[PDB]
Structure formats: C-alpha cells, structure tokens
Design a protein around this ligand. Structure first.
Ligand SMILES: Nc1nc2c(ncn2[C@@H]2O[C@@H]3COP(=O)(O)O[C@H]3[C@H]2O)c(=O)[nH]1
Ligand SMILES: Nc1nc2c(ncn2[C@@H]2O[C@@H]3COP(=O)(O)O[C@H]3[C@H]2O)c(=O)[nH]1
Ligand SMILES: Nc1nc2c(ncn2[C@@H]2O[C@@H]3COP(=O)(O)O[C@H]3[C@H]2O)c(=O)[nH]1
Ligand SMILES: Nc1nc2c(ncn2[C@@H]2O[C@@H]3COP(=O)(O)O[C@H]3[C@H]2O)c(=O)[nH]1
Ligand SMILES: Nc1nc2c(ncn2[C@@H]2O[C@@H]3COP(=O)(O)O[C@H]3[C@H]2O)c(=O)[nH]1
Ligand SMILES: Nc1nc2c(ncn2[C@@H]2O[C@@H]3COP(=O)(O)O[C@H]3[C@H]2O)c(=O)[nH]1
Lengths: 151, 151, 151, 151, 151, 151
C-alpha cells in the first residue's frame, strides 16, 4: 500500500511566506516520495470545483479569492499511509490547534491563513489529485532506497 | 484581537546554553511580532515581584537566585492568542512533561533549569510586561507578513 | 533590473537525495522570487537540445543519460542578478572545488553527480527557460517582501 | 538521579539514511551526556541475545536479520530520566503513531524500518549496555553545562 | 584580549524578514558573547550620527530613512577579534559580493536592503557602542563555554 | 578512488560544545561514509605518539593535556577525495582563518580550541587511522546510493 498517494498544496501564504522548501523537506525527510509537482496559480474555476462541497459556506466567498490570490505548490506524494500521515505532519486545520513539530503548528496562526492543505483521505486524494493533475504530470520512478524505508 | 501580547523571557540557562537565536527563531517563525526586547540581568527585586505568588515555595529563593545568577532576555511578542500559543510552543513547566517540538521539549531536562518563561495568562502578561518594560520600550509597528498571516 | 531570470534544475540525484526543499530553501531565503517550477522527467529531445553545446565531448550522452533516468525539478527563479548569484550559490560545476556554503560544496562530491544545474548566463538563461517551460507556466506575481529585498 | 542511563541505537537504515548527526543532535541539544558510542556491525549472538524477549514472535529473525545487515550506532546517553524521555524523543515504536517532533515521527514510516532503538526501562537499559558495551567504553566525564542543565 | 567588542545591528529588513533568531544564532554559535542588546526604532538623529561619515553620499538620506523606517536590533557581542570575524560572518557590504555561508551571503540580494551592520573596526566599535548604548546596558558576565572556546 | 579514507577527530570542545552530530551530519550529507567510529578518551600515550612530530614544540606540552583533557569522537570517513575535501569542510587550522560555511569557521574562534582535526593527507590518514584503530573497528558496507553520488 506503499503506492498510496496524497495531494498536498502549499497555499498562497505558504508561498509568500517562504515555506516552500521547508515544507517539501519535511516530506522528503520523513521518507515519502514526490510523484507530481508544479508551481501554479489556481484558477478561480478550479478553486470553485475544488472547494465545491463547502461552497454555500460563508468562509467560501473569499477562500477562492485568496486561494486564487497567489501562486500555490501543487504536489503529489507517495508512501505508506501518506494521506493519514501527511495529515499529521500538517497539523490540525486550525493552527490554533496544531502543535509544535507539525507544519502549521510551527509556522502559522490563524485558519484563513493556513499555509497548506493536505487531502483528508484516499477518497479525497483521488479526487483532488485527479482534479489537479494530468496523468502525465504524475511520474513513475523508484527510490534509492525503497529498501530502507520499507521492508 | 491580534494585538494580544505576552511576556517571554529566556532564562540564564537558555542564555548560557546559546538558545537565543533558536527561541527567537521560533516565534519569528510561527508568525508573531516582536514588540520589545532587551537583554539584561534582572534584580532580586525585579525577580521577587515577578515571582511573587511563589514567595511561599521553597524553590522560591532558589529560583530567585538562579534567575539572577546571569543575564536573561526579556521580550514581548505579539499576536492572536499569543499567550496560550506561546505557552504551548514553550513546552510545559516541567521539561519532563513537555512534548518533543516544544522548546522545553528539545532543549531542557529539568524544572529548575527549564530555560524559559512565558506568561500564563493575559493578566499575567499585562503584569509582567508592565513589570519588565517601560511602555515606551515597546515598538509600535506593522508586519510585512501581516496580511499573509492574518485574514 | 530585479527582473533578471535564471534556470535552476534539480538533477535526478539531488531529488533522489531528498535535497529538494533544501535547495529550494536556499533560494527563497536568499530573497529570490519563484517564477516557475516543475517536477518531471526531462525528454531525450529536450535534453539533447539542452546539452547541445557539448554534443561532442565525451561525457555527453552519459549526460543525457543520467539526465533522463529520473525526475528533475525544473525551476525559474527571479531577481536582481539571479544568474551570477545563483551560480555562486550552487557553487562550482565540479563539486570539489565547490566551497562549504554552496549546495554543491555542502551536499555532493563528483562532477558527474552534482545535484543541480543553473543557467550560466542570461543568454543561456533565456534559452534554458524557453526550452523548458511553456509560457503559460511562468507565474506573474509580486512578492510579500519586494520592498524589504529591494531599494 | 541525573545519573540514569539509556541505550540508544541507530538502526542500520537510519545510518543508511544519513540520520546519524541528526539524531545524535537531538540528544545533545536536549541536554544529555554521552557516555559511550560506537559504530558497528551487531553480531548474530549479540543480536539474538539482544532481541531475546521476542524469540518466538514472527518478525523475529527478520529482525536479526535486518539488524545484522549493516552498521548501527550504538550509544549510551546519560541523565535525569534518560530512559523515559529518550523514549518520548524517539517517539513510538511503530513510526505511524510517532508524532511530528520525534525522530520517528520526523524521519521514518514503518515499523520494520524505524531508525532506532532505545532501552524501554532502566531494567532493559541496564542489560542493553551490559550486553553492548565492554566497561572500558563507558566514558567518565563531567559536562560543560552540568550546572545549567541541573538544579 | 578576548574582550574585544563590536556593535551589530540588524536592519529593518532583517527584522521584517525574520532573521533575528538566525543572526543571533550564528554569533551564539561561533562562540561569542552577547554583552547587550535591545530592540528599538532608531531616530534620525541617532542614525545621522551613526552614519555620519556618509553624510556626503546620496544614498545617505535613503539609508537614514529606511534605517528608521522600522525597528532594528542593536547588540554588542564580544570576543577575540570579534570585529574582524563578525565582519567576515556578515558577509560583504554588497550582498552581490558576499560568499554563501555569510549572513549577507544566504539571506540578502542588495546594498540597500542588506539587513545588517556590524562595526568596521575597533574604533568604530567603541563609537557605535557608545552611541547606541549606555554603558550600564552592557552586561558584564562570564560564559559557561568559556574555557572550551578559549585556551 | 572512492574507497579513499580519512581520520576525523571531534576534539574535547567539540564534545563539550555539543557539535557532535552537527559535525557528523555535515559529512553525512555531503555524501561521504562513516567507516569507523567510537567515542573515547585518548590516552596520554596515544596523544603523544599521535602528536609526536610536533613534540618539542612549545604548544605541545598542554595540547596533549587538553587533548587528553576530555572525551573525543574518533572517526573514519570514506569517499572520493575525503582527505582533501574533508579538510575544506573543516576550515583553516586556525579558526581566525576559517570561513563561514566551514566547520571551524562557523563554531570556533581560537586555535588551541579548534574543535576537531582532520588528517592532512592520505599518508597521514593512514598513519592516524592505523594508530587510532583496530582493523575490526573499520566496517565494510555499501551505500544505499553509491549510484547517486558517484558514477
Ligand atoms: N476563515 C475560515 N477558513 C476556513 C474555515 N474552515 C476551513 N477554512 C479553510 O477551508 C480549507 C479547506 O481545507 P484546507 O485543508 O484547505 O484548510 C481549510 C481552511 O483554510 C473556517 O471556519 N474559517
Ligand atoms: N526548583 C524548582 N523550580 C520550580 C519548580 N516549579 C516551578 N519552578 C521554577 O519556577 C517556575 C515559575 O515559572 P516558570 O514559568 O519560570 O517556570 C518554573 C521554574 O523556573 C519546582 O518544583 N522546583
Ligand atoms: N561526468 C561529467 N559530467 C560533467 C563534466 N563537466 C561538466 N559535467 C556535467 O555536465 C553538466 C553541464 O552543466 P551543469 O550545470 O549541468 O554541470 C555539468 C555536470 O553535470 C565532466 O568532466 N564529467
Ligand atoms: N517488522 C516488525 N518489526 C517490529 C514489530 N514490532 C516491533 N518491531 C521491531 O522490533 C523492534 C524492537 O524494539 P525497537 O526499539 O528496536 O523497536 C521495534 C522494531 O524494530 C512488528 O510488528 N513488525
Ligand atoms: N542605497 C545604498 N546604500 C548603501 C550603499 N553603500 C552602502 N550602503 C548602505 O549604507 C551602508 C553603510 O554601512 P552598512 O554597514 O550598513 O552597509 C551599507 C548599506 O546599508 C550604496 O551604494 N547604496
Ligand atoms: N595553541 C596552539 N595550538 C596549535 C598551534 N598549531 C597547531 N595547534 C594545534 O595543533 C593541532 C594539530 O593539528 P590539528 O589538525 O589537530 O589542529 C591543530 C591545532 O589545534 C599553535 O600555533 N598554537
């Protein structure tokens, strides 16, 4: 299940804030593997289809707006239990609740300014990933050490 | 209400131990604003009122001595729920119980050499701040990050 | 003139080395804006095209080779003097003369496995980008600290 | 009681992972004195002896196995409460429940490849050392900041 | 003569940019002793005398403005050839020319946003120190590290 | 020549200072491989045979003395050109001359308090290594990536 994959976006702040590598490096060092990845400017349109569930939801409005407001880091990571796991590294959605050593616990404060999103699960993963990527953008390759990360 | 402030000092142990740059580094990193700070040797007087409610603690004159046994770094940091948050960053009063990822957590073993203090509550913060600093010393300014951290 | 660009690429071994957020960090922290970024497999055509000046020399398709055996992180970083400075950051072309502080002087040992590549002139630069990115991938945005980095 | 000891070992994958100075760092920065350290190949006898409590369970010689396929960094770290605290630093035994801040929560994903090991009682502790080090390898010295770490 | 001191301030750019903890962190790291430090907004008066010899520089009122455009961190650090050394750590006046590994080096692009100042010479240090600090503010103490850093 | 090996000792200060991992991690991340390694207390005797050339040399006297004065990190590293290379990472013997990004440039100040030694060359390597180690202490094994470090 080591081929599990999750979608991680470093949000507009993430980006202005200068936490790009930092974040990426946490995943790298934990042992997961970047499958896909590009720097973009989510479309309004996308943000809307991405954020559709939670559409008619106050916040909404301006989520897109800010989400749209800047370039983000679209990323796909691979590994055993990344969805779960990446969600921990992340921290709680509201930074108020995240803790030290997590991503958001360490560098952010407030919810509307969350620095990053991770899929909430495989079902999600799939959708977003599908929704965010093109088949080709995904890249098959193997580690220099699948052996020391997994048995 | 992103004006809440907190008092934080860095014990002699922190100082002697070289932990400034890192302590500071974590608050700069999470996003809070340094409103004042100086590096001094606090007086027994100062310590004694700072540590007033613990005057009936046997530790109490131990603290007071060691807390005056070398330079310390006083500071006020501000931001939204910066008093709770800071605490959490801090670790727990007893290092024994502070989670890795917390200052206390990676850096200190014991209660009496627990390198740092941060306010316990906003009233306490008002106090200590008043105690430690002249209002003048506190720097009123705006953050570049400002809009990126805050909604 | 804060507009100059450079093309940075993370060679397939630096990715394999879990050196991406690390090097991406060096950039960001130096002050550079990220224009465009992608993770991917370089094609033989692109690569050939890319290494064209040296189509004869020995090392050649051993280049193309390696160069196409894994993913790279392809990037475009902006800023005053990106191209010469980038350079100086990567350090020299053969790791061994690379100096402690540079990417290469810090992480890699031999010329043939030298984690990354940066355009060596704007000239090259201009070409490198042209070749590697569609234009719809250059991102147009203003930084948080434009006016902290520049006079 | 600042004398308690613990036995830490860097499993052959964490070495393979270039995680040694990293984890050694976590210790040192937390405040612990290093009593004894060695790099080496664990023998089958030692290892068998070492994993004795579990000679039956499945995972068993797959332990012994891995465990003898590479070098480990064998260490003894001193200090108040090394053994429980060490623990809390490594994080849980299965990486996935390991938390961001711990060695395991930061660097590793699966139980079977979990970078390191620490004695889980002083009891174990005492045995672990006894087994792994000759006595002529425990180093007797006083720290620079004995009296900054301890009351 | 391990008493030599130097003045170092951290520009508004450094401050706004979050580089305190790191700047401090490098001096704590190399081994020098922080003798005083405060965080203030310097006055044009202050800046103007500080920057006196450059009063005939066109940059001069640019500096003066920006140097007063936000809080700064003044400090005196001491140790053996701390004035030359510090400089070297610093980087070069022009970031363009400062070697990776230097503060200037990893962190700043341009001459007018070059985040930091450190004394050019001991006479200059005496001056600036006098300028910036009241003698009282400077902390006289001894280092734990003391004998470890010094013969 | 990728089997070249050099002797690196983290000196008594190195040790009290808490730079153990740090240093080790520079070698790890640069790509070299630890062949041998133990924490010890050099004998006077050893220090004498080690430091014999430069015997009847003022300094001498007390070099042993301090060298002897504390436990050190005996280490053996492997890689292409480690002798040379490790010597750069190191910095100049006198820290006064080392630069930022080097080991000693970054963390030490004065010569008698040098934090570490590296062999000055293959001839040296051999001798010290021989002199410091027992055949068995050396450990043959191969990387999880000799492939991405060397071609
Ligand atoms: N202002 C605001 N933003 C929210 C709230 N709940 C969720 N969001 C955002 O909605 C995002 C959707 O999931 P994310 O993982 O992207 O992180 C979430 C938050 O940034 C809320 O109550 N207020
Ligand atoms: N020696 C000692 N100091 C204590 C004890 N409990 C609290 N402290 C010290 O006194 C403190 C009061 O506030 P702090 O926030 O600084 O953190 C605690 C330590 O500095 C105790 O039981 N023993
Ligand atoms: N194997 C090998 N690769 C080389 C040699 N010189 C340059 N290169 C490689 O080819 C690359 C061309 O420029 P890079 O910036 O990509 O840095 C160079 C190295 O990857 C050489 O002598 N041998
Ligand atoms: N493969 C595998 N290894 C396990 C299991 N549980 C514990 N271990 C390993 O055996 C080790 C015994 O204690 P460690 O501290 O060394 O941590 C444990 C892991 O390396 C399991 O279910 N599977
Ligand atoms: N804009 C500008 N500032 C300069 C120039 N030369 C020096 N400086 C600034 O003025 C400085 C004088 O001392 P500093 O040490 O702070 O570093 C230099 C920068 O802050 C220049 O040519 N242009
Ligand atoms: N005090 C002092 N120590 C020195 C001098 N020259 C060399 N040493 C030490 O001699 C050591 C021998 O080589 P090292 O690589 O171990 O690093 C050297 C220095 O620590 C000198 O002129 N004075």
């Amino acid at each position: 299940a080591n081929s599990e994959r999750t979608f991680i976006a470093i949000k507009p702040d993430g980006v202005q804030r200068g936490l790009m590598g930092e974040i990426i490096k946490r995943f790298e060092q934990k042992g997961f593997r970047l499958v896909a990845m590009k720097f973009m400017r989510a479309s309004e349109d996308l943000l809307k289809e991405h954020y559709i569930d939670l559409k008619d939801r106050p916040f909404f409005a301006g989520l897109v707006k800010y989400m749209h407001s800047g370039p983000v880091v679209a990323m796909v990571w691979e590994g055993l239990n990344v969805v779960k796991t990446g969600r921990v590294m992340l921290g709680e959605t509201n930074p108020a609740d995240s803790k030290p050593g997590t991503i958001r616990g360490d560098f952010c404060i407030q919810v509307g300014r969350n620095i990053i999103h991770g899929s909430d699960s495989v079902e999600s993963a799939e959708k977003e990933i599908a929704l965010w990527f093109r088949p080709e953008e995904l890249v098959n390759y193997k580690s220099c050490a699948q052996n020391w990360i997994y048995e």
